[PDB]
Ligand binder design. Structure first.
Ligand SMILES: [Zn+2]
Lengths: 79, 212
């Protein structure tokens, strides 16, 4: 059946699409639609190289922009 | 049901028209030079449609016409050049660094098109007319007084390969800058443009052909 990709699919409001879960593999937890990217910070060059950041490294890291994992959060809440 | 086919494609035509109107606004210099920042990612696509993928913005300068051609009739989107690091095919030739009055990208280059082609990371000049995305993502790139430079091919392959690490990590795609929330494009016409596209999309799915 006939298919078509919205020119608005990369913009923030695409998250309010009713089929959003269906067309983006990651769903709300997909990094592609994360609300946590600071557009003026630089991603860590050490992280991308795969080498260990120095202590206190203040580049933007992937952990900064990745949503919390509900398994860790359901964990913390108990006890 | 031929009346209903004609409606479906009428909608698609209207959405295509409004889509090029929208792209023009976001490519316009007064709306995007603020965000043409060294290290920000940029999706480069030629007017004819060859897709060079994502690259790293290195520099951007105002375009200057040739001596013999004072008024070259450039549009606003053809009046600025962004120097972008792109992954070219090893097949692709030498990167001439200045564009002629009639070119949007250099003449002898092409994107990577074969597997077991690693590519070659080169800095390529592009008109704003070839910008089809700005990312929220910024890589770190050397600058004046940082002691590095993108003239070193080895630095280009170092930065280049991190951009492929970013794309590997972004399974669902590199995240775009939002024209409203990130670029704060105030134009009332642009505001209406995005709503016009949405209501037309609602019209288009209402049509049997969508799932036929
Ligand atoms: Zn780091």
């Amino acid at each position: 059946a006939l298919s078509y990709s919205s020119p608005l699919r990369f913009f923030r409001n695409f998250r309010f699409h009713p089929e959003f879960t269906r067309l983006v593999a990651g769903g709300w937890r997909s990094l592609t639609y994360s609300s946590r990217i600071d557009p003026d910070k630089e991603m860590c060059p050490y992280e991308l190289e795969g080498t260990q950041c120095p202590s206190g490294c203040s580049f933007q890291h992937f952990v900064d922009i990745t949503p919390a994992a509900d398994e860790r959060i359901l964990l913390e809440l108990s006890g | 049901d031929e009346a209903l086919i004609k409606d479906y494609h009428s909608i698609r035509e209207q959405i295509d028209q409004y889509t090029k109107d929208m792209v023009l606004v976001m490519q316009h210099p007064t709306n995007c030079v603020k965000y043409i920042n060294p290290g920000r990612l940029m999706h480069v696509v030629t007017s004819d449609g060859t897709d060079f993928g994502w690259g790293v913005i290195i520099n951007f300068y105002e375009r200057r016409p040739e001596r013999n051609n004072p008024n070259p009739g450039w549009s606003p989107q053809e009046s600025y050049v962004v120097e972008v690091l792109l992954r070219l095919s090893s097949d692709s030739g030498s990167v001439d660094s200045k564009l002629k009055d009639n070119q949007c990208i250099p003449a002898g280059i092409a994107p990577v098109t074969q597997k077991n082609d690693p590519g070659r990371w080169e800095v390529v000049p592009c008109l704003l007319s070839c910008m089809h995305g700005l990312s929220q993502i910024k890589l770190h790139v050397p600058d004046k007084k940082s002691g590095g430079s993108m003239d070193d091919p080895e630095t280009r392959r170092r930065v280049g390969k991190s951009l492929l690490e970013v794309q590997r990590r972004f399974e669902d795609g590199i995240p775009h800058m939002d024209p409203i929330e990130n670029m704060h494009i105030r134009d009332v016409e642009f505001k209406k443009l995005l709503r016009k596209i949405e209501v037309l999309e609602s019209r288009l799915v209402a049509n049997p052909l969508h799932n036929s």
